[PDB]
Design a protein around this ligand. Structure first.
Ligand code: CLA
Ligand code: CLA
Ligand code: CLA
Ligand code: CLA
Ligand code: CLA
Ligand code: CLA
Ligand code: CLA
Ligand code: CLA
Ligand SMILES: CCCCCCCCCCCCCCCC(=O)OC[C@H](COP(=O)(O)OC[C@@H](O)CO)OC(=O)CCCCCCCCCCCCCCC
Ligand SMILES: CC1=C(/C=C/C(C)=C/C=C/C(C)=C/C=C/C=C(C)/C=C/C=C(C)/C=C/C2=C(C)CCCC2(C)C)C(C)(C)CCC1
Lengths: 38, 72, 145, 138, 80, 151, 739
C-alpha cells in the first residue's frame, strides 16, 4: 500500500487519526456537551 | 447551557427530538433567542468569511494532492 | 431525463454511431435496452466471482446508491405513529432487562417528527439518486471511452 | 390520604414504568354499585370492586380514557370518578372534575383564558412581530 | 410385497371381538343415553348392544368395524 | 404460576419463571453487578476479566490474521482496542449522568463509584484478554501440562 | 336443527337506482366526490350496514352463492376456451414437441404478432396455466368433452346464482342455523372433503388411469376407447390391471392387496410421463377420503354421540395460561371476522404449501418439462397464499376493534396475551433485527470483501461456508427412506431429496437439489422477511384497541388515518395502517422467494440432459458462487435473464416486452400517492376549480382530494400491481425463451 510519493509515512498514521481518533474524540466531546444544566 | 443554546424551546425538550431539531434549526438565526436584526447580519457577515475560507482551503486540497501524488 | 439525454447522445457521437440514438430514442424500450441495460455491462462487472478491476469501486458504489435510494422509501412510505408504538416496546424491554437497566438513557427515545421523516426520506432518496447515476456515468464512460 | 380498593387484576406489561417513580404518576378513583368487568387502557381486562376503587396510571390521557369509558360503557353510567396527579414527593394534585362540575357544562366561577377579542382571520402579519419571541397568536 | 390376509374363516371372529371391545368401550364411558329412536334392549346381554340407544349401538358397530379392520389388516401384515 | 410483580399489578411487569423465579433471583443477584457488599472497584474487575477473556475469541479464529502466524496476536490487539473503547464509553456515561448529585442508596450509581467500576472494568478487561491470549500462544505447553507430558 | 324466516326481503329493482342506500350517510345523496369512493369501499362492509347479526349472516350466506357463481363462469370459460380456441387435440397427439396454446388474438392494429408459432400448425398465445397437463391426467381426449364440461359450468353458475337469491329473498336461514358449528364441520370434513376425495378417486380409477396408461403406450387419442366404454366392457378394465377378475368383495372381504395392481405405492414419477403415478394418487385419495369421512364423526349433533368443542376447549387449562381456551368457542360462533381471520391464515399458508409441493412432486403429465408452467404455477400460488395471510392480519385486527368483548374474555388465552403484548412485540422486534443483520449483513460482508479482492474472506462453499447441516441431514433420511422407514414405498416421494435424475424428452423433470451455503443464506433471508411481515401484522392486531400513545384507539376504529400531529405525530397507528405496511413486506418477502425459486431451478436443476446422462443447466450452476452477493443477483440473475424480455420487441413475446415497461410505469405512479398527502392536492384543486367557476363549468359534485386512507390504499394498490406486472412479464419472457 506504500506509495512512491515523499512523506509516505504520513498516510500510515494519519488515516488512523482521521478514522479512529478524530471521530472518537469529537463524537465523545459532542456527547458531553449535550449534557449540561438547562 | 444545555445544547441548543439558541433556543430554550428545544433545550427543555426531554426527548431525543432535542438533538435533531437542535441541528436543523442551527442555521436559522432569525429563530434564535433574542435575535435582533443588527445582530443577525453581523453573524451572517462572519459566517460568510468562514465559508469563503473553506472554499479556498478545498481548492488547496486538490492542488496539493495533485502536486504530491499526481502525475501532472 | 436531462442527463440521460446528454449521455446517450454523446455515447453515439464519441462512438461514431449516432444512428443508435437517432433510431431508438423515439420509444422508451430503446432507452431501457440500449442506454440503461447495455451500458451497465462493464460497470456491474467491476467485481465478480472471477476477478477485480479498476471499476470495482463504481460497481460497489452503484449498489450503495441503490441501497440508500430504497432506504429512503421507508421514511417516505411508513409514517410516524407506527414507529412510536414500536419504540415504546423497546423502551419497555430495556427497563425490564436486568444488567441493561443499569444503563438509563439521559434522553428519552422517540420516533422522528413528521417533517423530519419527510426530510430524511428525501435526503436518502436524493443521495441514492446521484450516487447511483454518477457511478454509472463514470464507469460506463470510463470503461468504454 | 384518600384511597380506594385496587381493582382485581392479574397484571399487565402496559402499565407503569420508571416515570412513575421518577417524575409523576396519575391516580383515578371511582365508586361502583357492583363488581363488573372493564377494559384497562394498559390492555387486557380487569374488574372493579363494589364501592370505592383506586388505580394508578402513567398518563393523564389514560385515566381520562378510562373515565370516559366508565361514563359510557355501563348501564349505571359511573360519572363519580376523580383524577389526581401524584408526585414522588408525596404531593397530590386534583385534576378532573376540576372545579367540581364537568367542563362540558358551563359553570360560574371559571376564569376565561385563551379567548380572543378578535376573529381568527384578524391576526397580525408575521412581518409585524419580526425578531420578537412572540407569534401572531400572542 | 404388498401382502395381506385374504380369506374367510376367523375373519368374522376378529371384527366381532372388536365389536365386543367397542360395546365395552361405549358403556365404559360416553354420553350414553337417549338419542333419536332406539328399539330398546333390556339390561346387558345381546341387549347390552342395543341398550346404548339408537345411535350408540349403530355408532359402536361402526367403531367396532374400523377397529376390526385396523386389527385384522394389522395382524395379517404381521411383523417381518 | 405467573402473577403480578411484587403484588403491584399496575406496575407494567409480570412475575414469571424467568423474571422472578427462585433461580434467577439468586443468579442475577449474585452476579458481580448486584452482589451485596462489594465495592465498585471489585464489581468492575470481575465484569472485565470475564468479558476480556472471551473477547479475543472472534478475531483469533475469524479475524483477518486468522490465515497467518499472527492470528493470536492479531486477535489480542483486536480485543484490546475493543475494550479501550468500551472503557471510555463507560467512563463517559458516568461522567454525564452523574453530573448533578448522587444517590446514597447504591454506591455503584454515583460519580465516585461508577468511576471505580470503569477503572475496574478496564484493568479486568485488559487482563482477561491478555491472559487468554497467553494461553492460546503457549497452548502447546498447556496441552502437555494436563496430559502429564512433562510429568 | 333447521330454522328459517320466509320472504324477509321483497325483490324490487327500486334500490338499484338508489346507490348508497345500504348506508344512512350515503342514502341521502352526494355533495362531494368523496361520496362516490365511499359507496364502493363500504359495499361489502355488512357490519357497518346493520347491527343485526342474523341479517348480515344472511347477506354473507348469499354473497358466497354469488361468488361460487362467477368462479363457475370463469372456470367454464377455461373449458370453453380449451374446447373451441385451443390446440389440445393437437397437443395430445405429440405432447413432447407441441407447446400448449389457447386464446386466439384477433388480427388488428398489428397485434396478430402475439399469435406465435407453438408447433402443430397452430398460432396463438402460449399458455402457462398447465391446463393441458391437467386435462390429460383427468382423462380428456376430445374437444367435445371439454365443451360439455363448459356448459355444465354455466348450469352450475346459474344454479349457484339462484341459490343466493333463494336463501335471502325466499328462505333465509335463522341466526341459530349458522351457529351449528359442530354439525357444519361434520359435513365439510366428510361431505365436501371426504366424498369429494372418494368421488374423485372413482373417476381416476375408471377414467383417468386406464386411458392415461394407453398414452404411455402411445395408442394415440382417437384409437383409445371412450371413458364410459371401460365400464360397458369390464373385460377392458380387466385386461389392464388383472385384479378386476375378482373385482368387488376383496374390498368387502378385506383382501385389498389384490387391488395392488392399480392401487400402488411406487412413490416416484412415471419416466415417460414426468408426473406422479395415477395409481398412487388414486390409492391416495381413496385413503384420504376414508380418513375424512371418519374425522367427520367426532362432533356433537342430534344423536348424542360426539364432542362439544365448547367442552373440549374449556377443558384445556394450564398453569401458564390461567382459564385457558374458555370463551374461544363463543367468539368463534358470534364474530365472523374471528372466523375469517383464522381461515385466511390457514388457507393462505396452505396455498403456499401447494406451490412448494407441486414443483417437487409434479402431479401432471409433461408438467415438469414445461419450465414456464412450473415457474408460473409456483409463483402464482405463492402470491395468492401471500395475499391471504395478510388479510389474516386485517380481520385479526378488525375482530379486536369491533367484536372483542372484555367481559367475555377474562384471564383467558386471548386476554392473557393482550396483557403482555409489549413483551411479544419487544422480542419479535429483536428477532427481526437479529435475522436482519445475520442474513442481509452477510451479503454485504461478501459484496465488500469481493470488491476489496478478498474472496477468501467472504462466505462461500469455496471459502468459509455456512452449511445447512440439518436440511442436508434431512435429505439423507428422505432418500434412504424406502426399504427401511418406508418399506412398502418403492422409491422416495421426491427426487429433489436425492436419487436418480429423472429426465423426459431431453429435459430434466426433477433431480436432487443440493443445499450449500448459497442456499443457507437465502433461507435465512426468507426467515427474516417472513418474521418482519408477521411483526407488522401481529403488532397491528394486539395494538388495534389501545396503546400507551392512544389508549382510546379502539373508539377511533379500525380504519382511520391518524390522531393528529400531537404526541409528536400519530400517523398510521390504526390496524388498517398495519395491513398497509404489512402488504409491502408480504410483497418484498415473496419476491425473494420466487427469485430464489427461479434462479435455483434454472441454475442447479433444470437444463438439457444428453443421452449419456450428463446435465447442462441453463445458468451453468453459477448460483452457488454468485447468489452470495447482491451484485451477483443484480448481474447474473436480473441483468442476464432480463435480456429475454427487453429484446422481445418484434417477436410473439413482444407483449411481455411492453408489459415489462407497463409494470414499471404504475410502480413509479404509485410513488406519487405514497410520498404526498391530500393537503397539497386539495389546494391545487382550488386553483383548478376556480378556472371552472370562471367559465361556469364547476361540477355540482364538488371536487375533493382523496381521503388520507384512500391515498394510501391507492398507493399500495399500484405499487403491488406494477411490482408484480414487472416480475410477471420478466418470468414469462425468461421461462418461455429457455424452454
Ligand atoms: C479540503 C481539502 C483537502 C481534502 C479533501 C484532503 C483529503 C485527504 N488528505 Mg490532505 N491536506 C490538505 C487538504 C485536504 N486533504 C492540505 C491543505 C494539506 C497541507 C497542510 C494536507 C496534508 C495532508 C497529509 C500529510 C496527508 C493528507 C492525507 C489526506 C487523505 C486522508 C485524510 C487525512 O489524512 O487527513 C489529514 C489532514 C490534514 C493533515 C490537515 C489538512 C488541512 C485542512 C484540514 C484541510 C481543510 C479542510 C476543510 C477546510 C474542512 C471542511 C470540512 C467541513 C465539513 C468541516 C485524504 C484524501 C493523507 C494521505 O495522503 O492519504 C493518502 C496524508 O498523509 N493531507
Ligand atoms: C445558498 C445558500 C443557502 C443559505 C445561506 C441557506 C440558509 C438557510 N436555509 Mg436553505 N436552501 C438552499 C440554499 C441556502 N439556504 C438551497 C439550494 C435549497 C434547495 C434544496 C434550500 C432549501 C431550504 C429549505 C426547505 C429550508 C431552508 C432553510 C434555511 C434556513 C435554515 C437552514 C437550517 O438551519 O437547516 C440545516 C439543515 C441541515 C444542516 C440538514 C442538511 C443535510 C445535508 C447537508 C445532507 C447530507 C447528506 C450526506 C451526508 C451527503 C454525503 C453523502 C455520503 C452519504 C456519502 C437558513 C436561513 C429552512 C428554513 O426554515 O428557512 C428559514 C428551510 O425550511 N432552505
Ligand atoms: C430498502 C431500504 C430499507 C432498509 C435497509 C430497511 C431496514 C429495516 N427495516 Mg424496512 N421499510 C422499507 C425499506 C427498508 N427498510 C420500506 C420501503 C418500508 C415501507 C413498506 C419499510 C417498512 C418497515 C417496517 C414496518 C419495519 C421495517 C423494519 C426494518 C428494520 C428491521 C431490523 C433489521 O433488519 O435489523 C438491522 C438492519 C439491517 C440488517 C439493515 C442493514 C444495516 C447494515 C448492513 C449495517 C451497516 C454496518 C454498520 C452500521 C457500519 C457503521 C456505519 C456508521 C459508522 C455510519 C431494518 C432497519 C422493522 C423494524 O423496525 O425492526 C423490527 C419494521 O417493523 N421496515
Ligand atoms: C386400532 C385399530 C387400528 C388402526 C386404525 C390401525 C392402522 C394402521 N396400522 Mg395397525 N395394528 C393394530 C390396530 C390398528 N392399526 C393392532 C391391534 C396391531 C397388533 C398389536 C397392529 C399392528 C400393525 C403393524 C405391524 C403395522 C400396522 C400398520 C398400520 C397402518 C398401515 C396401513 C395399513 O396397511 O392398514 C390399513 C389402513 C387402515 C385400516 C386405516 C386406518 C386409519 C383410521 C381411519 C384412523 C382411526 C383412528 C382411531 C380409531 C381413533 C380412535 C381411537 C382413539 C384411542 C384415538 C395404519 C395406520 C403398519 C404401520 O404403520 O407400521 C408401523 C404396520 O406395519 N399395525
Ligand atoms: C370469465 C372468464 C373469461 C375471460 C377472461 C374471457 C376472455 C376472452 N374471451 Mg371468453 N367466454 C367465457 C369466459 C371468459 N372469456 C365463457 C364462460 C364463455 C362461454 C359462454 C366464453 C365464450 C367466448 C366466445 C365465443 C369468444 C370468447 C372470446 C374471448 C376473447 C375476446 C373477448 C371479446 O370478444 O371481447 C368482448 C366484446 C364485447 C377474450 C380473450 C372470443 C375469442 O375467443 O376470440 C376469437 C370469442 O369469440 N369467449
Ligand atoms: C367426484 C369427482 C368427479 C369429478 C370432478 C369428475 C369430472 C369429470 N368427469 Mg366423472 N366420474 C366420476 C367422478 C368425477 N368426475 C365417478 C365416481 C365415475 C364412475 C362412474 C365417473 C365417470 C365418468 C365418465 C364415463 C365420464 C366422466 C367425465 C368427466 C368430465 C366431463 C364433465 C362433463 O362434461 O359432464 C369431468 C372432468 C366424462 C369425460 O369425458 O372424461 C374426461 C365422461 O364421459 N366421468
Ligand atoms: C364413488 C366413486 C365410485 C363409483 C360411482 C364407482 C362405480 C362402480 N364401480 Mg368402483 N371403485 C372405486 C370408486 C367408485 N366406483 C374405488 C375408490 C375403488 C378402489 C377400491 C373402486 C374399485 C372397483 C372395482 C374392482 C370394481 C368397481 C366396479 C364399479 C361398477 C360396479 C357396477 C356393476 O357392475 O354392477 C360401478 C360403475 C366394478 C366394475 O368395474 O364393473 C363391472 C368392479 O368390479 N370399482
Ligand atoms: C376471504 C375473502 C375476503 C372477504 C369475504 C373480505 C371481506 C371484506 N373485507 Mg377483506 N381482505 C382480504 C380478503 C377478504 N375480505 C385479503 C386476502 C386481504 C389482504 C389484502 C384483505 C384486506 C382488507 C382490508 C385492509 C380491508 C378489508 C375490508 C373488508 C370488508 C369490506 C371490503 C370492501 O369494502 O370491499 C371494497 C373493494 C374495493 C373498493 C376494490 C379495491 C380495489 C382492489 C381490491 C384492487 C384490485 C387489483 C386488480 C385485481 C388488478 C388491477 C386490474 C386493473 C388495472 C383493472 C369486507 C367484510 C375492509 C374493512 O374491513 O372495513 C373497515 C378493509 O379495511 N379487507
Ligand atoms: C437453531 C436455533 C436454536 C435452537 C434451540 C432450540 C429452541 C427450541 C424452541 C423452544 C420453544 C419453546 C416453546 C414453549 C413451550 C410452552 O408452550 O410452554 C407452556 C406455556 C403454556 O402451557 P400451559 O401449561 O398453560 O398449557 C395448558 C394450557 O395452556 C392449554 O393451552 O406456553 C407459554 O408459556 C408461552 C410461551 C411461548 C414461547 C414463545 C416461543 C416462540 C417460538 C420459539 C421457537 C421457534 C422455533 C421454530 C419453530 C416454532
Ligand atoms: C455461568 C453459566 C453460564 C454462562 C457461561 C458462560 C457465558 C461462560 C463463561 C465464561 C467466562 C467469560 C469466564 C471467564 C474468565 C476469566 C478469568 C479467569 C480471568 C482472568 C484473568 C487474569 C488472571 C489476568 C490477570 C492479569 C491482569 C488482571 C492484568 C495484569 C496481570 C495479568 C495479565 C496476569 C450459562 C448461564 C450459559 C449456563 C450456566 C453456567
Amino acid at each position: 500500500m506504500d506509495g512512491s510519493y515523499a512523506a509516505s509515512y504520513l498516510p500510515w498514521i494519519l488515516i488512523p487519526m482521521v478514522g479512529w481518533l478524530f471521530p472518537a474524540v469529537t463524537m465523545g466531546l459532542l456527547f458531553i456537551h449535550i449534557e449540561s444544566e438547562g | 447551557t444545555k445544547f441548543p443554546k439558541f433556543s430554550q424551546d428545544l433545550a427543555q425538550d426531554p426527548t431525543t427530538r432535542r438533538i435533531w431539531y437542535g441541528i436543523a434549526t442551527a442555521h436559522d438565526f432569525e429563530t434564535h433567542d433574542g435575535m435582533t436584526e443588527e445582530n443577525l447580519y453581523q453573524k451572517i457577515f462572519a459566517s460568510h468569511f468562514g465559508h469563503i475560507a473553506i472554499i479556498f482551503l478545498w481548492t488547496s486540497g486538490t492542488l496539493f494532492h495533485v502536486a504530491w501524488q499526481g502525475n501532472f | 431525463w436531462l442527463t440521460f439525454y446528454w449521455h446517450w447522445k454523446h455515447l453515439g457521437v464519441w462512438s461514431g454511431n449516432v444512428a443508435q440514438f437517432n433510431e431508438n430514442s423515439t420509444y422508451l424500450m430503446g432507452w431501457f435496452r440500449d442506454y440503461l441495460w447495455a451500458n451497465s455491462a462493464q460497470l456491474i462487472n467491476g467485481y465478480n466471482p472471477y476477478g477485480v478491476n479498476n471499476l470495482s469501486v463504481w460497481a460497489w458504489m452503484f449498489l450503495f446508491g441503490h441501497l440508500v435510494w430504497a432506504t429512503g422509501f421507508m421514511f417516505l412510505i411508513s409514517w410516524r405513529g407506527y414507529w412510536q408504538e414500536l419504540i415504546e416496546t423497546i423502551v419497555w424491554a430495556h427497563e425490564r432487562t436486568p444488567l441493561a437497566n443499569l444503563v438509563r438513557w439521559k434522553d428519552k427515545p422517540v420516533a422522528l417528527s413528521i417533517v423530519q421523516a419527510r426530510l430524511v426520506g428525501l435526503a436518502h432518496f436524493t443521495v441514492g439518486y446521484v450516487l447511483t447515476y454518477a457511478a454509472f456515468l463514470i464507469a460506463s464512460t470510463a470503461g468504454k471511452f | 390520604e384518600l384511597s380506594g380498593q385496587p381493582p382485581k387484576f392479574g397484571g399487565s406489561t402496559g402499565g407503569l414504568l420508571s416515570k412513575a417513580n421518577r417524575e409523576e404518576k396519575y391516580a383515578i378513583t371511582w365508586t361502583s354499585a357492583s363488581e363488573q368487568v372493564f377494559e384497562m387502557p394498559t390492555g387486557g381486562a380487569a374488574i372493579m370492586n363494589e364501592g370505592e376503587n383506586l388505580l394508578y396510571l402513567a398518563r393523564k390521557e389514560q385515566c381520562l380514557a378510562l373515565g370516559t369509558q366508565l361514563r359510557t360503557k355501563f348501564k349505571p353510567k359511573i360519572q363519580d370518578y376523580k383524577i389526581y396527579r401524584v408526585y414522588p414527593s408525596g404531593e397530590v394534585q386534583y385534576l378532573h372534575p376540576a372545579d367540581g362540575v364537568f367542563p362540558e357544562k358551563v359553570n360560574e366561577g371559571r376564569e376565561a383564558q385563551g379567548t380572543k377579542t378578535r376573529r381568527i382571520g384578524q391576526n397580525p402579519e408575521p412581518v409585524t412581530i419580526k425578531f420578537s419571541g412572540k407569534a401572531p397568536y400572542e | 410385497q404388498a401382502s395381506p390376509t385374504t380369506a374367510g374363516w376367523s375373519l368374522s371372529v376378529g371384527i366381532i371381538m372388536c365389536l365386543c371391545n367397542v360395546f365395552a368401550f361405549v358403556i365404559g364411558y360416553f354420553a350414553i343415553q337417549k338419542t333419536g329412536k332406539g328399539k330398546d334392549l333390556a339390561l346387558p346381554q345381546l341387549a347390552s348392544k342395543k341398550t346404548f340407544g339408537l345411535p350408540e349401538l349403530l355408532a359402536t358397530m361402526s367403531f367396532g368395524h374400523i377397529l376390526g379392520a385396523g386389527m385384522v389388516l394389522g395382524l395379517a401384515s404381521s411383523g417381518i | 404460576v405467573v402473577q403480578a410483580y411484587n403484588g403491584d399489578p399496575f406496575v407494567g411487569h409480570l412475575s414469571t419463571p424467568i423474571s422472578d423465579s427462585a433461580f434467577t433471583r439468586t443468579f442475577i443477584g449474585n452476579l458481580p453487578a448486584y452482589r451485596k457488599g462489594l465495592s465498585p472497584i471489585l464489581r468492575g474487575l470481575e465484569v472485565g476479566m470475564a468479558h476480556g477473556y472471551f473477547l479475543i475469541g472472534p478475531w483469533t479464529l475469524l479475524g483477518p490474521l486468522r490465515d497467518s502466524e499472527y492470528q493470536y496476536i492479531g486477535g489480542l490487539i483486536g480485543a484490546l482496542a475493543l475494550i479501550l473503547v468500551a472503557t471510555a464509553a463507560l467512563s463517559s456515561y458516568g461522567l454525564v449522568t452523574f453530573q448533578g448529585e448522587q444517590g446514597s442508596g447504591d454506591t455503584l450509581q454515583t460519580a465516585d463509584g461508577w468511576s471505580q467500576f470503569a477503572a475496574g472494568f478496564f484493568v479486568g478487561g485488559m487482563g482477561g484478554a491478555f491472559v487468554a491470549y497467553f494461553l492460546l500462544e503457549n497452548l502447546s505447553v498447556v496441552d502437555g501440562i494436563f496430559r502429564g507430558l512433562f510429568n | 336443527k333447521v330454522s328459517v324466516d320466509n320472504n324477509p326481503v321483497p325483490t324490487s329493482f327500486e334500490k338499484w337506482g338508489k346507490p348508497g342506500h345500504f348506508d344512512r350517510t350515503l342514502a341521502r345523496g352526494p355533495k362531494t366526490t368523496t361520496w362516490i369512493w365511499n359507496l364502493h369501499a363500504n359495499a361489502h362492509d355488512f357490519d357497518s350496514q346493520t347491527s343485526d347479526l342474523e341479517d348480515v349472516s344472511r347477506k354473507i350466506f348469499s354473497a358466497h352463492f354469488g361468488h361460487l357463481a362467477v368462479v363457475f363462469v370463469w372456470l367454464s370459460g377455461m373449458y370453453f376456451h380449451g374446447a373451441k380456441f385451443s390446440n389440445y387435440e393437437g397437443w395430445l397427439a405429440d405432447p413432447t414437441h407441441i407447446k400448449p396454446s389457447a386464446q386466439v388474438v384477433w388480427p388488428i392494429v398489428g397485434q396478430g404478432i402475439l399469435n406465435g408459432d407453438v408447433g402443430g400448425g397452430f398460432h396463438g398465445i402460449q399458455i402457462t396455466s398447465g391446463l393441458f397437463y391437467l386435462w390429460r391426467a383427468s382423462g380428456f381426449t376430445d374437444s367435445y368433452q371439454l365443451y360439455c364440461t363448459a356448459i355444465g359450468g354455466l348450469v352450475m353458475a346459474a344454479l349457484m346464482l339462484f341459490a343466493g337469491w333463494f336463501h335471502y329473498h325466499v328462505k333465509a336461514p335463522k341466526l341459530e342455523w349458522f351457529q351449528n358449528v359442530e354439525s357444519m364441520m361434520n359435513h365439510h370434513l366428510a361431505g365436501l372433503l371426504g366424498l369429494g376425495s372418494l368421488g374423485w378417486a372413482g373417476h381416476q380409477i375408471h377414467v383417468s388411469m386406464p386411458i392415461n396408461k394407453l398414452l404411455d403406450a402411445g395408442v394415440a387419442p382417437k384409437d383409445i376407447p371412450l371413458p364410459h366404454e371401460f365400464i360397458l366392457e369390464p373385460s377392458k378394465m380387466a385386461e389392464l390391471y388383472p385384479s378386476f377378475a375378482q373385482g368387488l368383495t376383496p374390498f368387502f372381504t378385506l383382501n385389498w392387496g389384490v387391488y395392488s395392481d392399480f392401487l400402488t405405492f411406487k412413490g416416484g414419477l412415471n419416466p415417460v410421463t414426468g408426473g406422479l403415478w395415477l395409481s398412487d394418487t388414486a390409492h391416495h385419495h381413496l385413503a384420504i377420503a376414508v380418513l375424512f369421512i371418519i374425522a367427520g364423526h367426532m362432533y356433537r349433533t342430534n344423536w348424542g354421540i360426539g364432542h362439544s368443542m365448547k367442552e373440549i376447549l374449556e377443558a384445556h387449562k394450564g398453569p401458564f395460561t390461567g382459564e385457558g381456551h374458555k370463551g374461544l368457542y363463543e367468539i368463534l360462533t358470534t364474530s365472523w371476522h374471528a372466523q375469517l381471520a383464522i381461515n385466511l391464515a390457514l388457507l393462505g399458508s396452505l396455498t403456499i404449501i401447494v406451490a412448494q409441493h407441486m414443483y417437487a412432486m409434479p402431479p401432471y403429465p409433461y408438467q415438469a418439462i414445461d419450465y414456464a408452467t412450473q415457474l408460473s404455477l409456483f409463483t402464482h400460488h405463492m402470491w395468492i397464499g401471500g395475499f391471504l395471510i395478510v388479510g389474516a392480519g386485517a380481520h385479526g385486527a378488525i375482530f379486536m376493534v369491533r367484536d372483542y368483548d372484555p367481559a367475555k374474555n377474562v384471564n383467558n388465552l386471548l386476554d392473557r396475551m393482550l396483557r403482555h403484548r409489549d413483551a411479544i412485540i419487544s422480542h419479535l422486534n429483536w428477532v427481526c433485527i437479529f435475522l436482519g443483520f445475520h442474513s442481509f449483513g452477510l451479503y454485504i460482508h461478501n459484496d465488500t470483501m469481493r470488491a476489496l479482492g478478498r474472496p477468501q474472506d467472504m462466505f462461500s462453499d469455496t471459502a468459509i461456508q455456512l452449511q445447512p447441516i440439518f436440511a442436508q441431514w434431512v435429505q439423507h433420511l428422505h432418500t434412504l427412506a424406502p426399504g427401511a422407514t418406508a418399506p412398502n414405498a418403492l422409491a422416495t416421494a421426491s427426487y429433489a431429496f436425492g436419487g436418480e435424475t429423472i429426465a423426459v424428452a431431453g429435459k430434466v423433470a426433477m433431480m436432487p437439489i443440493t443445499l450449500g451455503t448459497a442456499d443457507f443464506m437465502v433461507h435465512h433471508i426468507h426467515a427474516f422477511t417472513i418474521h418482519v411481515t408477521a411483526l407488522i401484522l401481529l403488532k397491528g392486531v394486539l395494538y388495534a384497541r389501545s396503546s400507551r400513545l392512544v389508549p382510546d384507539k379502539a373508539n377511533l376504529g379500525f380504519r382511520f388515518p391518524c390522531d393528529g400531529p400531537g404526541r409528536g405525530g400519530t400517523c398510521q397507528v390504526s390496524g388498517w395502517d398495519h395491513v398497509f405496511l404489512g402488504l409491502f413486506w408480504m410483497y418484498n418477502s415473496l419476491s425473494i422467494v420466487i427469485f430464489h425459486f427461479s434462479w435455483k431451478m434454472q441454475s442447479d436443476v433444470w437444463g438439457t440432459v444428453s443421452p449419456d446422462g450428463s446435465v447442462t443447466h441453463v445458468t451453468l450452476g453459477n448460483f452457488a458462487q454468485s447468489a452470495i452477493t447482491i451484485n451477483g443477483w443484480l448481474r447474473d440473475f436480473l441483468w442476464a435473464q432480463a435480456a429475454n424480455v427487453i429484446n422481445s420487441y418484434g417477436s410473439a413475446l413482444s407483449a411481455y416486452g411492453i408489459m415489462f415497461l407497463a409494470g414499471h410505469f404504475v410502480f413509479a405512479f404509485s410513488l406519487m400517492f405514497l410520498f404526498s398527502g391530500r393537503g397539497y392536492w386539495q389546494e391545487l384543486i382550488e386553483s383548478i376549480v376556480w378556472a371552472h367557476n370562471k367559465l361556469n363549468v364547476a361540477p355540482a359534485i364538488q371536487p375533493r382530494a382523496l381521503s388520507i386512507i384512500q391515498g394510501r390504499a391507492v398507493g399500495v394498490a399500484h405499487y403491488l400491481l406494477g411490482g408484480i406486472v414487472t416480475t410477471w412479464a420478466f418470468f414469462l419472457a425468461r421461462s418461455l425463451s429457455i424452454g
